[PDB]
Amino acid sequence: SNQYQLPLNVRPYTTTWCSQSPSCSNLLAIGHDTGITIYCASEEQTPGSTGLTLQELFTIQTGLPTLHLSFSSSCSYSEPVYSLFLACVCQDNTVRLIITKNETIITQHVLGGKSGHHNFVNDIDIADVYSADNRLAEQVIASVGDDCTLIIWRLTDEGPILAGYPLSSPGISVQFRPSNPNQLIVGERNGNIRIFDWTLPWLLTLNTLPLVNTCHSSGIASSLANVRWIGSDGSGILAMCKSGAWLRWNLFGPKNLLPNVQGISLFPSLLGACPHPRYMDYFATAHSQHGLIQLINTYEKDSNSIPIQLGMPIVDFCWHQDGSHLAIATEGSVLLTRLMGFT
């Protein structure tokens, strides 16, 4: 493990790799109480133990807390100059898209007030949509909140298009489908899981609550932590409960009648699962409060693998695109740790 300190007065809230855009996949953003900081990951000589070190590049000041953070495919590099596009959520309950050239915010769009969410925003994600001619036609941001609303915010050539959709319960996560921006997934706090075609009722709703194996009772309150697609065509869906209970469904052949596989993490997962970018069957989950991280294999290859235990709480974490490195933001730092097995 190598450890890289965040500035002394910087409290991290969120950590994400720029896996969404290959030109910028070595860019790391930390949303904190005064903005979003960008770091670069480089192969040093090091020892080929952790043959990867972190270089802090710069800090984008915003003046208020950043709670969720997503890079877009529009990110680019030039010589040098970084052209960034970031979706995030701020203390004023607004959802924003910030477009920068390095630390300087050259452009900013803000969706808030009554036109925005009418309660706390719980999650956000972003994807670039191109026309048939293949110019940038739209950038699309999806967000979910405690106002029982899902918001699709499309920024198009002739300007913004806003749409709201009602939910049976607070939205706790949302993510567009890989290799198919026409589809996306929305998570409700109550265990409902929506598959949605925004170009169009919405196509499908699964639910983890009634499926709990109950060989070991998952408890009275098993609030849904997370749902994410897996695979590079978005061939699968993985859902994780706060309790640690997880379930996986695949989407291809024949007729289907239950979720394909199911299990339970050793610990609660407040932050939910972070699926491996290269190995579908694998995902990571943290015991954020004691600072341990379990690695789970869906086809039970795993047998309780806990590669990571810190002596401190974990605020957030995410896989580097290479699949062997992990970046983890803790309350005062970010660690890059390399698991030798995944190399």
Binding site: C148, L150, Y165, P166, L167, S168, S169, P170, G171, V186, G187, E188, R189, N190, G191, N192, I193, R194, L204, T205, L206, N207, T208, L209, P210, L211, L224, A239, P259
Partner: peptide
């Protein structure tokens, strides 16, 4: 399933 039904209830809220 329960998760689906919950997510629908949420949307109706």
């Amino acid at each position: 399933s329960n998760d689906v039904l919950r997510s629908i209830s949420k949307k109706f809220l």
